């Protein structure tokens, strides 16, 4: 019902949860209260790193006791990753640089998924990205993770 999450700053966050909430949902509640992006969060319990797709009830937690988790910040670094959403619900992770062309992005999607660049439309903030341009030609806030949507023609 009520659980506690320790942070490196010595602060302790109280959250309201239920056994059927996913770990991802726990990370989302931490984002609501503290503004920390879930992709940065590592939740630790009894030396185990909790998995996003699982529920608290998937873990063997004794409900008599109050549950205390430890939050560690992983990195949003060691390269520049971006994310491309597909119609089949999958999400492709790619490694890119600002000076990569949109066409090069489509080429990387071809290497990973086998989809010809001819057929790819890349969408960002309601804009179709142009093949001859670079990511840096667009005004992308690099402090945020970049998410594109892929549609076929
Ligand atoms: Cu504690
Ligand atoms: Cu490159
Ligand atoms: Cu290729
Ligand atoms: Cu997204």
Residue numbers in the entry: 1 to 153
Original authors' sentences:
Af1 and Af2 were independently evolved against the same target 67B89. Attempts to crystallise the purified Af1:7B8 complex resulted in crystals of Af1 alone that diffracted to 2.2 Å, allowing elucidation of the Af1 structure in the unbound state. The superposition of Af1 with the Af2:7B8 complex shows that the two Ub domains have different orientations. Solvent-exposed W142 of Af1 is not involved in domain contacts between Ub-N and Ub-C, as observed for the corresponding Y141 in Af2. Af1 Ub-N und Ub-C display almost identical overall structures (Cα RMSD 0.2 Å). However, there are differences in the conformations of the α2β5 loops. Presumably, the −2 register shift of Af1 Ub-C is incompatible with the binding mode observed in the Af2:7B8 complex, which involves a −4 shift in Ub-C, and would result in clashes of Af1 Ub-C with the target.
Affilin proteins, artificial binding proteins based on the ubiquitin scaffold, have been generated by directed protein evolution to yield de-novo variants that bind the extra-domain B (EDB) of oncofetal fibronectin, an established marker of tumor neovasculature. The structure of ubiquitin (Ub), a 76 amino acid signalling protein conserved among all eukaryotes, features a single five-stranded β-sheet enclosing a short α-helix. This process recruits amino acid residues from β5 towards the N-terminus to an adjacent loop region and subsequent residues into β5, respectively, remodeling the binding interface and leading to target specificity and affinity.
